[PDB]
Each structure stands twice: as C-alpha cells, then as structure tokens.
C-alpha cells in the first residue's frame, strides 16, 4: 500500500521530538517532551514534508517544509504559533 | 528509487544513513574511517531519522512507516527497541 | 503529478538554512543566510533526497544523499565545491 512520509527533528536533552507526517495530502504532527506522544497544532495540506529546527538559547525555532505538486511552503515555529515563511522556489 | 534518511552527531562526525528499499530499512554507518553496516533491520517503506546527545552519549529515534502505521525504533546504547511513538493515520 | 520531494538543515543562531528539492529527476538547493532566499551552487541528478550537516568551530560540513533508483550518491560541501563522497551502500 501506499506509504506515509514522514519527517522528524529533536532538540534539547529532554528530548522535545516533533514528528510531521504527510497522509493523503494532508500533514499533521505528533509531539513528545518526556511524558506521552501528543497531537501539535501544526495542519496544513502536503503530500511531501522535511523539517529542520534550532535553538536560540533556549528558544526553539522550527521550519517545515510543506510540499504539494511543484510548490513548496515554508512554515515557520518561531514562539508566535505558526507562521507563513518567505522561502520560495522557482520548480 | 529507493529512500533515504540521514543524521550525524559531533565533529568526528559520526553519520547513520537509513535506506528504505523494497520494504526493508538497512543502515550504514561512518565514525571517521570508513562506511560499514549497522545492526538496524527493520521493516519499513518510508523512513525519517532524529537523534540528540546526552553528554557524550548519541540517542537515536527512527520512523520506520509501512501504510499509515509508523514504528518508532529507539537506540539508547543497547540495541534498538520499539518506542512508544503512535499516530493516528 | 507527483509532489516534489525536499530535504532540509540548519545551522547556527541566523540560522543558516538549506533546503533541496527532487523534481523530475534533478535535485537543487535554495539558500538563507538572513537576508532572502537564493539559490545554491548543488545541482544534482536524483529522485530522492535526504541532508545532514554538522559545524567545527563556524565552518559547516553538508552531506547530500541523492538516489536514482536503488543508487545513491553521497555529496560533500566541505567549503570548497561539492565532491562526491565515498559512501556506498549495496541496494
Ligand atoms: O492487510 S493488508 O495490508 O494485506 C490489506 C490488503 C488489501 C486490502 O484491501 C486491505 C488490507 C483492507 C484495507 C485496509 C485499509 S486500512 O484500514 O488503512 O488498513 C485500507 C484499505 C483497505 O482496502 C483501503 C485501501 C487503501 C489504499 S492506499 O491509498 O494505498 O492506502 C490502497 C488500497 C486500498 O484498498 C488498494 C490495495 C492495495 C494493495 S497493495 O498492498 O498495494 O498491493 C492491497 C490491497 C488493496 O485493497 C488489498
Ligand atoms: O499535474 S496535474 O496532476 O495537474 C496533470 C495531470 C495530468 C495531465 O495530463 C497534466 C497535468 C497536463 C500535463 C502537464 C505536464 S507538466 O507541464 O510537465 O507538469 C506534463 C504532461 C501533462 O500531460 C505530460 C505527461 C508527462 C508524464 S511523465 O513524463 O511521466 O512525468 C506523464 C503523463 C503526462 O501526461 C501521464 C499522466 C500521469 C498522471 S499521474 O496520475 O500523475 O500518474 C496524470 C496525468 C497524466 O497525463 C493527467
Ligand atoms: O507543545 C506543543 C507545540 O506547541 O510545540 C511546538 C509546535 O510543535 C506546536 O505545533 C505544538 O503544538
Ligand atoms: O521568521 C521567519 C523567517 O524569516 O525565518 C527565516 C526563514 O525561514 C524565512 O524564510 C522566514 O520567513
Ligand atoms: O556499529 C555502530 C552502531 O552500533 O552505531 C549505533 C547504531 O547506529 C547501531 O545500529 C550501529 O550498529
Ligand atoms: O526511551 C525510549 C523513549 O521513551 O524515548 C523517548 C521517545 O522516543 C519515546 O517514544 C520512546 O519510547
Ligand atoms: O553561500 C552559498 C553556498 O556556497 O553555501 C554552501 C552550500 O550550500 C553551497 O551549495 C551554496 O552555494
Ligand atoms: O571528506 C569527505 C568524507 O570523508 O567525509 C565524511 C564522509 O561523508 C565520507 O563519505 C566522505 O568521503
């Protein structure tokens, strides 16, 4: 059958874990900090997803990668929920 | 084609590559001198890859997804044992 | 059709940030240092990607995993070009 896709990044010592996974068109994350796997508020359309995050200090920040045909959306975890990026792509 | 994740840790670096190929995840390993297999084994059609230092000691998690069902495989220092990741797919 | 297929990493407090996309058949990387997007020097054959990097001191190491069927290349940025790299795998 057809498979989901998924991407996953961490940080800390905890560790926080956020997992995105693109089912059917649709991406929708899953998140750990130490106690129980929970449903994140990230959902936005993709039938692709990557992520990469990092820390300032202690203040994490996210981007994902939200892909559907040839356009690619950037959606930005920067303490303020999330937000469109400005990341284009000419494919 | 088949499907790939990767990760690495400090500035040796050591770097894990997960290949996803006819239903089977396999894993090549680097810590400085050359690529060899690693014990991961597992099923799965679709992978992603995290990992984290504790100190000096690596904690890896793979997401191994075959269908809507995703198996989380965790490297702690002993082996690799399922996780307690699930998703509603 | 088929979506495009991404890979991305970050480095840094700015951050750096890099993200690759397979799109018919040809990977290629649009940059952040900041200041807008750009597009990267990487341009590669390959229908799937995956991406890790790491930093000594401030110099960053990229390593890009490009398959095309049941091979993949391991590419390297070291600061001077992309090289291939010497990872193997029998698929
Ligand atoms: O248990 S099995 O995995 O062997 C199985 C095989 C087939 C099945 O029809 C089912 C199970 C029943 C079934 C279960 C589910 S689930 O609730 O998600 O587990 C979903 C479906 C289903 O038929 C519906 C379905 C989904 C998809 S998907 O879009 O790729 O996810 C494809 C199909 C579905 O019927 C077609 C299909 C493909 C395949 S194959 O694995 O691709 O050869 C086997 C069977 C199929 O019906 C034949
Ligand atoms: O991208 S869309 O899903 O909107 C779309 C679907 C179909 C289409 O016919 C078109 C677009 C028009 C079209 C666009 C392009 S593009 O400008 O390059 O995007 C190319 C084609 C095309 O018909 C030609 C074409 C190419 C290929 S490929 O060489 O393998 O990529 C396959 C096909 C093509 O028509 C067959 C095809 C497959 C599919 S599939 O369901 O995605 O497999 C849908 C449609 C198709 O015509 C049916
Ligand atoms: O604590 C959960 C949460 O706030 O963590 C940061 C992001 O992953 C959000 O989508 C998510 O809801
Ligand atoms: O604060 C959001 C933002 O500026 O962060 C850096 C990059 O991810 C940009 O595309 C994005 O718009
Ligand atoms: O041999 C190196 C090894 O132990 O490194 C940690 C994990 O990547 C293991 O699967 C792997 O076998
Ligand atoms: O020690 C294993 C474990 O608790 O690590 C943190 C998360 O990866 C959990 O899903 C997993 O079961
Ligand atoms: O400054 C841009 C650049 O040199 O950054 C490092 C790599 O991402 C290169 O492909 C890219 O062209
Ligand atoms: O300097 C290049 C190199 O040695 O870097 C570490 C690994 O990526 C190797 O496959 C690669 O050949």
Same mark, same amino acid.
């Given at each position: 059958?057809?498979?989901?896709?998924?991407?996953? &990044? $961490? +940080?800390?010592?905890?560790?926080? /874990?956020?997992?995105?996974?693109?089912?059917?068109?649709?991406? *929708?994350?899953?998140? %750990?900090?130490?106690?129980?796997?929970?449903?994140?508020?990230?959902?936005?359309?993709?039938?692709?997803?990557?992520? &990469? $995050? +990092?820390?300032?200090?202690?203040? /994490?920040?996210?981007?994902?990668?939200?892909?559907?045909?040839? *356009?690619?959306?950037? %959606?930005?975890?920067?303490?303020?929920?999330?937000?469109?990026?400005?990341?284009?792509?000419?494919?």
């Amino acid at each position: 059958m057809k498979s989901v896709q998924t991407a996953a &990044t $961490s +940080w800390g010592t905890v560790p926080s /874990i956020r997992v995105y996974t693109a089912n059917n068109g649709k991406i *929708t994350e899953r998140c %750990w900090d130490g106690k129980g796997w929970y449903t994140g508020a990230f959902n936005e359309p993709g039938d692709n997803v990557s992520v &990469t $995050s +990092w820390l300032v200090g202690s203040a /994490i920040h996210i981007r994902v990668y939200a892909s559907t045909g040839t *356009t690619t959306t950037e %959606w930005c975890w920067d303490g303020n929920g999330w937000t469109k990026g400005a990341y284009t792509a000419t494919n």
